[PDB]
Enzyme design. Structure first.
Site, mmCIF file in Angstrom:
data_model
loop_
_atom_site.group_PDB
_atom_site.id
_atom_site.type_symbol
_atom_site.label_atom_id
_atom_site.label_comp_id
_atom_site.label_asym_id
_atom_site.label_seq_id
_atom_site.Cartn_x
_atom_site.Cartn_y
_atom_site.Cartn_z
ATOM 1 C CB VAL A 36 -0.955 0.010 1.203
ATOM 2 C CG1 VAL A 36 -1.896 1.200 1.149
ATOM 3 C CG2 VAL A 36 -1.729 -1.290 1.335
ATOM 4 C CG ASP A 148 3.847 -5.347 -12.884
ATOM 5 O OD1 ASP A 148 2.955 -5.478 -13.762
ATOM 6 O OD2 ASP A 148 3.642 -5.451 -11.659
ATOM 7 C CG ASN A 153 3.627 -0.698 -11.720
ATOM 8 O OD1 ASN A 153 3.021 -0.413 -10.687
ATOM 9 N ND2 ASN A 153 4.080 -1.910 -11.982
#
Ligand SMILES: CC(C)(O)c1cc2nn(-c3ccc(CO)cc3)cc2cc1NC(=O)c1cccc(C(F)(F)F)n1
Length: 291
Positions: A36, A148, A153
């Site tokens: 988080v 990723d 991102n």
């Protein structure tokens, strides 16, 4: 080298990692992959504090390796289109990564206009695409495979400068892996089979370019097609046009540059890794795309 924070400092700057959204005065900004992220102030510097938690199918060792990798990558990789690690906490409770805050959060969140942010102009999307590609190019120049690349991102600074984030799964430099990682909806066929190649990031970037063009997340379970990269097949099969999927939440999208970006998206999304443009070509095509 980065600042080594005590977990308590980051507890303090994130208002005890206040789980309440930033949008309602809290510190939680996003539940990123494997942690988080909390808004914080270290002195007067707004920071993103990524508190790493077990979450979904992550071991402590793998999480620590991804922390160590994030820091390792972020040490080697300072670039205007990569997020900036300010430092980290390994001292207590959860592992924490402190970054220069990205006021405009994720491209994903901005593409979805999460928390009522205004839709990204095509103009800003082109800058973001360009920036993200410049970020990916820098990672690839530095023989890092992000693994990723996704809108989640690609973070957005005060200027909607694309900042590639989350280098936890980043890889130095093709090789294969037993631990297949990345976001399914963004992953190249070869990435999904455990190939680790920069070419996978290009593919994933292609999905991002489709996300940027369409404002559609790579995956929406409640959408047909669920996978955004399917729309590439729908457009190639002339079932749908790019203008059918083009984000309606733009007024400044010109067909030429959207087709230009879709062309980059398409080329990036070549299911054959070797027929994809390297990030440099993607860069050139995304620069070419804005005259
Ligand atoms: C990406 C994340 C956590 O989802 C994030 C979400 C955000 N939302 N908003 C936001 C939304 C809505 C309004 C209203 O206009 C204003 C602000 C700002 C944000 C900033 C974020 N990330 C970062 O600042 C950041 C920087 C570097 C490394 C990292 C990471 F932890 F991901 F590695 N994160």
């Amino acid at each position: 080298r980065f600042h080594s924070f005590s977990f308590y400092e980051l507890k303090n700057v994130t208002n005890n990692f206040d789980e309440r959204p930033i949008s309602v005065g809290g510190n939680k900004m996003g539940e990123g992959g494997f942690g988080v992220v909390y808004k914080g102030y270290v002195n007067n510097t707004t920071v993103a504090v990524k508190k790493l938690a077990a979450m979904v199918d992550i071991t402590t060792e793998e999480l620590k390796q991804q922390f160590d990798q994030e820091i390792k990558v972020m040490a080697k990789c300072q670039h205007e289109n990569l997020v900036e690690l300010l430092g980290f906490s390994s001292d207590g409770d959860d592992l924490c990564l402190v970054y220069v805050y990205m006021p405009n959060g994720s491209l994903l969140d901005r593409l979805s206009c999460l928390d009522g942010t205004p839709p990204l102009s095509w103009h800003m999307r082109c800058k973001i695409a360009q920036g993200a590609a410049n970020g990916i190019n820098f990672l690839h120049e530095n023989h890092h495979i992000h693994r990723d690349i996704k809108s989640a991102n690609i973070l957005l600074d005060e200027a909607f400068t694309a900042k590639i984030s989350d280098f936890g799964l980043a890889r130095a430099s093709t090789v294969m892996t037993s631990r297949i990682v990345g976001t399914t909806a963004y992953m190249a066929p070869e990435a999904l089979r455990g190939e680790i190649t920069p070419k996978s990031d290009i593919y994933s970037f292609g999905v991002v370019l489709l996300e940027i063009i369409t404002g559609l997340p790579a995956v929406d379970e409640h959408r047909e097609p669920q996978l955004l990269l399917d729309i590439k097949e729908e457009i190639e099969d002339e079932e749908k046009t790019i203008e059918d999927y083009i984000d309606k939440k733009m007024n400044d999208a010109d067909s030429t540059s959207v087709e230009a970006m879709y062309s980059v998206a398409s080329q990036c999304l070549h299911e054959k890794k070797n027929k994809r443009p390297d990030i440099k070509k993607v860069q050139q095509l995304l620069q070419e795309m804005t005259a």
